[PDB]
Amino acid sequence: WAESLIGLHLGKVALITGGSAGIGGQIGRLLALSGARVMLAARDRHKLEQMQAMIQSELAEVGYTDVEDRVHIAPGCDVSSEAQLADLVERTLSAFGTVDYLINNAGIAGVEEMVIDMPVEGWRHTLFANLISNYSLMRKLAPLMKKQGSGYILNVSSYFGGEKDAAIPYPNRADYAVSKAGQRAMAEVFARFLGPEIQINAIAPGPVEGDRLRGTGERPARRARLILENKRLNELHAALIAAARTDERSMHELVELLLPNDVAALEQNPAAPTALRELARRFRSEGDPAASSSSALLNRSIAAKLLARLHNGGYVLPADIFANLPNPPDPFFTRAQIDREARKVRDGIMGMLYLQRMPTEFDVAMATVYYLADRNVSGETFHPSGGLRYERTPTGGELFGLPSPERLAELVGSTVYLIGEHLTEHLNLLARAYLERYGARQVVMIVETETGAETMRRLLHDHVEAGRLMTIVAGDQIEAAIDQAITRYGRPGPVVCTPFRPLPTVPLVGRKDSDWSTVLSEAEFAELCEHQLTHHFRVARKIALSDGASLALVTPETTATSTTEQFALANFIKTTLHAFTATIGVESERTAQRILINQVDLTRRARAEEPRDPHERQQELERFIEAVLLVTAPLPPEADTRYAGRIHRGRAITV
Amino acid sequence: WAESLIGLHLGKVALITGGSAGIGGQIGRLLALSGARVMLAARDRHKLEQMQAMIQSELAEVGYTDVEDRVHIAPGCDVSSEAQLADLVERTLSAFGTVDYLINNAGIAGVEEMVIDMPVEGWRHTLFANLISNYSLMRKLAPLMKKQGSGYILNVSSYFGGEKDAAIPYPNRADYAVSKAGQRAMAEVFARFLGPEIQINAIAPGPVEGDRLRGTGERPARRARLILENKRLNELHAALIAAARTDERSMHELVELLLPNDVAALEQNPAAPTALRELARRFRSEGDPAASSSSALLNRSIAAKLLARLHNGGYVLPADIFANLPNPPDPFFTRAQIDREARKVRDGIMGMLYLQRMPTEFDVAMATVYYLADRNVSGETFHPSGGLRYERTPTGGELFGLPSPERLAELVGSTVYLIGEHLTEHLNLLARAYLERYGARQVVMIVETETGAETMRRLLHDHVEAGRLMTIVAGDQIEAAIDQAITRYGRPGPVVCTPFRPLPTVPLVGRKDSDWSTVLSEAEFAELCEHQLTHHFRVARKIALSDGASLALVTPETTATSTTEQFALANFIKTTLHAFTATIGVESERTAQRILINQVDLTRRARAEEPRDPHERQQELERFIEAVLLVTAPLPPEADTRYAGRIHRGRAITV
Numbered sequence A, B: 001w002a003e004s005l006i007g008l009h010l011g012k013v014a015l016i017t018g019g020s021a022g023i024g025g026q027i028g029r030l031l032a033l034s035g036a037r038v039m040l041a042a043r044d045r046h047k048l049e050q051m052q053a054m055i056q057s058e059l060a061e062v063g064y065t066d067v068e069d070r071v072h073i074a075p076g077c078d079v080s081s082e083a084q085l086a087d088l089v090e091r092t093l094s095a096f097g098t099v100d101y102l103i104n105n106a107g108i109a110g111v112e113e114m115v116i117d118m119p120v121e122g123w124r125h126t127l128f129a130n131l132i133s134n135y136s137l138m139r140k141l142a143p144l145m146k147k148q149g150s151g152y153i154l155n156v157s158s159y160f161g162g163e164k165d166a167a168i169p170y171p172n173r174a175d176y177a178v179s180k181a182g183q184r185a186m187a188e189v190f191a192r193f194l195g196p197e198i199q200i201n202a203i204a205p206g207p208v209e210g211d212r213l214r215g216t217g218e219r220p221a222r223r224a225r226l227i228l229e230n231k232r233l234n235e236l237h238a239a240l241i242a243a244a245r246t247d248e249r250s251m252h253e254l255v256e257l258l259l260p261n262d263v264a265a266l267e268q269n270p271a272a273p274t275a276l277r278e279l280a281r282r283f284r285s286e287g288d289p290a291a292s293s294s295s296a297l298l299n300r301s302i303a304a305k306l307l308a309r310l311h312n313g314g315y316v317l318p319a320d321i322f323a324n325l326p327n328p329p330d331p332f333f334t335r336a337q338i339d340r341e342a343r344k345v346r347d348g349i350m351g352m353l354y355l356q357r358m359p360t361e362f363d364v365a366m367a368t369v370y371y372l373a374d375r376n377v378s379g380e381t382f383h384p385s386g387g388l389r390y391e392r393t394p395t396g397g398e399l400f401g402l403p404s405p406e407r408l409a410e411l412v413g414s415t416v417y418l419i420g421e422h423l424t425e426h427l428n429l430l431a432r433a434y435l436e437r438y439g440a441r442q443v444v445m446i447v448e449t450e451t452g453a454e455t456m457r458r459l460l461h462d463h464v465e466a467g468r469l470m471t472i473v474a475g476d477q478i479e480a481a482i483d484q485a486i487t488r489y490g491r492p493g494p495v496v497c498t499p500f501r502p503l504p505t506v507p508l509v510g511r512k513d514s515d516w517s518t519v520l521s522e523a524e525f526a527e528l529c530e531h532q533l534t535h536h537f538r539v540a541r542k543i544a545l546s547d548g549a550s551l552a553l554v555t556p557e558t559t560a561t562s563t564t565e566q567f568a569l570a571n572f573i574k575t576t577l578h579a580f581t582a583t584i585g586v587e588s589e590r591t592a593q594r595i596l597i598n599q600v601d602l603t604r605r606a607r608a609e610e611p612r613d614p615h616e617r618q619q620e621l622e623r624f625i626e627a628v629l630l631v632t633a634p635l636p637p638e639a640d641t642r643y644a645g646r647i648h649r650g651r652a653i654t655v
């Protein structure tokens, strides 16, 4: 079976992260059999030593000599650590000299929570491990590739990273999905800079058959119980948030209704809000009578996670409010309920597959090693396995109008939050539109610095003097700044989130004979992700937890005079953020959250599409206001049908 | 170099159309070297015999015996002929038994004209050769594949066939682009029906280095002269159409201004329409003084093509109007002008390439033969070469509003054409919207049959009685029906084109042990293309030539109860038509035609997205009216900037 392989990559040097197991281990194995010298990087020394021994033994069987010189390992390499990535490259160049193939394969599953349960530091960790590490190793190895005249960078992405002009929602996996999309977007935007010497592509396999204790989650008991526990969390949280919106009682007083932990008692309480009574009826109806979740509202773990949501949304509750909660007797969910959910998850994944069979890690690696021989592709995403039924979200519509007068009527008297700093003209125009045209009660302007605050206060002095425009300085503490806005000015209706910072103007590749010292650094790439991705994630997480009505995520602006590097970085951000917007849109829809989250893009693909004179610029800015109103005007009560609700969440439109 | 190849496809039988040269010849060569028995089909016997001899000689060199039994040919096979496709399959099964790989490679360049210069029969020929033939051979060979438990269908598409959620405009190549998109869409929608036994995928190479006398046009003197002649045609035609719109003189009287064939005389004529005087100034300014096109308006070949445009748009001119046209002396365009345009075309294509090198036919076929070994992909489009800078048009935006009141004001007093038959509720609602809400002067309802006409007249009896609704019966002569509307009721402003026919409800695949006798036939697939693609092309061609202001192309309707086969065929049509809409949008924009052409989709990807109750259905139909108004309301004079004009052409939105 190896005859087609031997010789295919003779003379090449390959570095494979995550190379001791999974797809990466098989890619390393087959590259070695094809004649490449390989360096396998991973954390655990023992697994690496086992994989190295297996590959070396196989090489000797087919006739290679001195096999210890053909397969090396780099243990203790956690790709989320920049220092360990630097050491990995030093070790690889010491062993083999210049690297020909960089196989960016390592990937972690990530936080595996909904955005509103996702710690900010966990999000950042996923980005460092799965995305920033890919840039870091490219930045270290591409100079030598260019100097020798050839090289290859392959980012191992996922079907769930989306495709060129469509996002694929991956609920409960937003950090992972964003990291996978960024891997593809990196190949898409760097290809023109890295050519002609260097190819850069992504692979995006679908679910792969593998070790059922590891993997990054695409392939198929405790997870089923966790699904049922987070369903109970979502239903309780949505009903409490909704009740608090239209009831005079505080959130504290509403949570006190749950403390007897008695489903029937809550349903039968004539003074309980209708949303909580109807929820209790559903628990009793939809529940297994042998499960204590049909008669008890909560257990202690759900209660703690619910309390965290409420605190993180700025609701005031004592930390010991659930300390005396009656503990429901086992089982909270029955074995039958758990096995039913488990079969549902498994059958759902298998039902995606047109070919009705799961590919193996060996199969996917074999297709990948053949693909690596192709010298005429760059900026592409190859699907070594595929044929999947799954929901997708097309991006990049440009033809749109204003929202309906019915939706615009919902803005009268509203509290609007605007977040930004450097897009001062856009912020001024938006504040004036909401206040002067659509009857908003007031606008809270949340900026990064005092200098940004004073600039906006001067631009909006008339509304500042009239008490209609308030300004808050957030720095790097956007969540605390939103809490100040909630306490002092009230919870937001519409929210618009623009980036604090502009895009950098440094080179993206170096000249063949340069040291690359001015090229975008590993730290600067991490800073780019912080200001243009993590910024929006933090705001979306906080605003959803705080019961905002709508949220527009706005990408950086490209213009007719943006540098070619700014266009590349802007389109990288636009594609990668689409994965976030699509995923959180579906998350919110499926868990009965009312918030509408969408994306408004100030970035275009090509300079020739941009406005060229003051008239066209006026047209563009009017389009921006129309786009933001189209996604932030709330749906009136007789409109938020199942059908309309899916339309108005998770979308991206291009100004 | 062949060691990786020998054995890879041992025991397989492959049929390759277009197999005597080009990419198809190399695919046949490398499949044979990999161990497959191959049948090569093409028209010319001599080229096939040469290719067969070359492959057989190479097989004997590497050790195969009885090579005459491994490479067969089928000469005289024109894939546009259904009878010849039937004979090809009979000949192949007689030689080899069951076919394992169907390589649908044959492709013709097509008409190579703008839509408004494209004969309807030439369009149809391209569809038969490049797209309908692919279904026909699948329909004949898939039953045997399924019966044996395995098979592979590969459609050789093009980069310019687009990708999953974006169209790629290919100006002057609409027939070709549509055929390439349909090849990909066929793989996308049939994969779930053909699995698990049968894989179906497309390849979409970019430009390939090949024989410069053939090819399908993607790769780079007479073509440069033709480009310059069609630029002169476009500029004259656009100025005449525009002048006739706002001048009291007939088209006949306006063309009489051109008959002295004197650029300076037309520029200096104080009684000539400003659009013609300004055009003449440009000819004198932008022209090479050594070229007679700088002092003469036309030559006889341009004049004949211009007269055809005008006649085909219903303008009345004597057939001999140019019979006495003064013939300009050679050269009409200088060698320098022609070489400059030639370098422009070549450098443009080469400038697309990130890797700055053209792939060879051998390279692309090698990557394709490796790809064919992958058993875990279906419904995918593999790019064996790629890395291209090129404009794309994302499809499938769902979040839109009404158009601006400024654009809606442009509808007051307008003449509207509506085309359709089976979507009677949509036609009634649209007619009533234009007449009752937006002040249109009258609506001409163009249907297919008398029964359709009477149904609409009854639904709209009040507007019929008031003379606001006129009805015309088109049958299979839509162009003659539009000419009747022009003569009797005036030229159209907005036009809406819906399909006459619904989608069929027959099976798309047969049971393993059936004769497939009820499965969608080759003739029924051709009929599908006629009613759901060629219908829109004929209307777009005629309405653009007749100076319509805007045109909405509307796809079939899917609902919550459409059959699974209807969803598949509807999405096939939606994807394939996007290629047409995007291409003609850019064609119109680049040649200064004012018409706005866009697509409104009544098809969705998934049943779960459809309305489920009367309220959601009401919401859907309101969205349809809003979508059609958003694309058909004309741009007021102070709005049709370069920037806004590109936004409002070539787009597709999903209701």
Ligand SMILES: NC(=O)c1ccc[n+]([C@@H]2O[C@H](COP(=O)([O-])OP(=O)(O)OC[C@H]3O[C@@H](n4cnc5c(N)ncnc54)[C@H](OP(=O)(O)O)[C@@H]3O)[C@@H](O)[C@H]2O)c1
Pocket: A017, A018, A019, A020, A021, A022, A023, A024, A041, A042, A043, A044, A045, A047, A077, A078, A079, A080, A104, A105, A106, A107, A108, A129, A156, A157, A158, A159, A204, A205, A206, A207, A208, A209, A210, A214, A215, A216, A217, A218, A219
């Ligand atoms: N699995 C699928 O179905 C699937 C589908 C699509 C895409 N993908 C992509 O395929 C790639 C590999 O996935 P997989 O299923 O093979 O994953 P996996 O089974 O978890 O991969 C295990 C390998 O990764 C190493 N590794 C794990 N965490 C690491 C870290 N932080 N730093 C360095 N090495 C690390 C492991 O060794 P140590 O634990 O000792 O570090 C081992 O070498 C990922 O990029 C993933 O996103 C997978």
Ligand SMILES: NC(=O)c1ccc[n+]([C@@H]2O[C@H](COP(=O)([O-])OP(=O)(O)OC[C@H]3O[C@@H](n4cnc5c(N)ncnc54)[C@H](OP(=O)(O)O)[C@@H]3O)[C@@H](O)[C@H]2O)c1
Pocket: B017, B018, B019, B020, B021, B022, B023, B024, B041, B042, B043, B044, B045, B047, B077, B078, B079, B080, B104, B105, B106, B107, B108, B129, B156, B157, B158, B159, B204, B205, B206, B207, B208, B209, B210, B214, B215, B216, B217, B218, B219
């Ligand atoms: N060329 C490119 O740059 C490029 C790029 C992307 C996609 N493609 C796709 O690649 C495929 C092959 O393109 P190519 O460049 O190889 O084309 P080509 O050079 O014109 O292909 C020549 C082969 O096609 C046969 N052929 C031509 N017309 C035929 C017909 N009507 N019926 C049957 N056989 C016919 C020729 O033999 P006879 O003349 O004797 O019939 C010969 O076998 C097409 O599907 C094309 O759309 C090409």
Ligand SMILES: [Mg+2]
Pocket: A557, A558, A559, A560, A602, A610, A611, A620
């Ligand atoms: Mg701009």
Ligand SMILES: [Mg+2]
Pocket: B557, B558, B559, B560, B602, B610, B611, B620
């Ligand atoms: Mg529908």
